[PDB]
């Protein structure tokens, strides 16, 4: 059993880890104590990056994120989201909430759907198993692109496994 906090710093990009530490501390969470979510924040940030034609909302400091979002909402005619999205697609002209889950994707998809009370915001969930689920079966990215995200997730998993971190990481996902 290795250290998740060690794993994370020598696994993800220094930029992803840096943005995830802010995201955590911004909510009185300490990345050194809650290492499992620390790793979940990095993996999700990383997927938002591989995914993005796109405007990255996630990772930005709250004030900047809402500034970017609002400016978007009135250059276009899109309704203001309530919760900040992760991305904005001006191709399909909609926001995107992205999720990486260790649980059943359909369950996670609904929790997100019920939270954002969406009308137009798109939802796309990825898991560590390869199963995915996107709004109206509209998967946005072509196959190869989505295949890369799934690869990076598997890679993250097994590197977590060799260090004995997977077992704890995989079953500590809360709603």
142 is in an annotated binding site: no
SS3 97: strand
Contact region for Mg ion (CB under 5 A) — 9-17, 34-42, 72-80, 84-92?
84-92
Report yes or no: 173 and 102 within 8 Å, Cβ to Cβ.
Answer: yes
Q: Quick check: 46 binds Mg ion (CB under 5 A)?
A: no
Q: Which residue is nearest to Mg ion (CB)?
A: 58
Q: Which residue has the tokens 């260790």?
A: 102
CA–CA distance, 77 with 109 (Å, rounded to integer):
26
Residues designated as active site: 58, 86
Which is closer to Mg ion, CB of 21 or CB of 86?
A: 86
Q: Which of 58, 88, 109, 122 binds Mg ion (CB under 5 A)?
A: 58
Q: Which residue has the tokens 């992803």?
A: 16
Least distance (Å) between residue 116 CB and Mg ion: 11
> In sequence order, what DSSP letters do the residues of 29-84 get, joined into one string?
--TTT-HHHHHHHHHHHHHHHHH--EEE-TTS-HHHHHHHHHHHHTTS-PPP-SS-
Which is closer to Mg ion, CB of 35 or CB of 121?
A: 121
Which is closer to Mg ion, CB of 59 or CB of 102?
A: 59
Summarize the annotated binding site for Mn(2+) as residue ranges.
44, 58, 86, 97-98
Residues of this chain that interact with Mg ion (CB under 5 A) are 58, 86
């Amino acid at each position: 059993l290795g250290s998740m906090e060690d794993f994370v710093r020598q696994c993800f990009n220094p930029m992803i880890v840096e943005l995830a530490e802010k995201a955590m501390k911004e909510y009185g969470e300490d990345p050194k104590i809650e290492t499992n979510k620390f790793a979940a924040i990095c993996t999700h940030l990383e997927v938002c990056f591989m995914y993005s034609r796109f405007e990255i909302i996630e990772g930005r400091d709250r004030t900047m994120a809402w500034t970017v979002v609002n400016s978007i909402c009135n250059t276009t005619g899109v309704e203001k989201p309530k919760f900040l999205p992760d991305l904005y697609d001006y191709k399909e002209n909609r926001f995107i909430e992205i999720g990486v889950t260790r649980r059943e994707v359909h369950t996670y998809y609904l929790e997100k759907a019920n939270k954002i009370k969406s009308e137009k915001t798109h939802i796309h969930i990825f898991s560590f198993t390869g199963e995915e689920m996107a709004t109206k079966a509209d998967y946005t990215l072509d196959e190869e692109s989505r295949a890369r995200i799934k690869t990076r997730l598997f890679t993250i998993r097994q590197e977590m496994a060799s260090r004995g971190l997977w077992d704890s990481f995989r079953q500590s996902e809360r709603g």
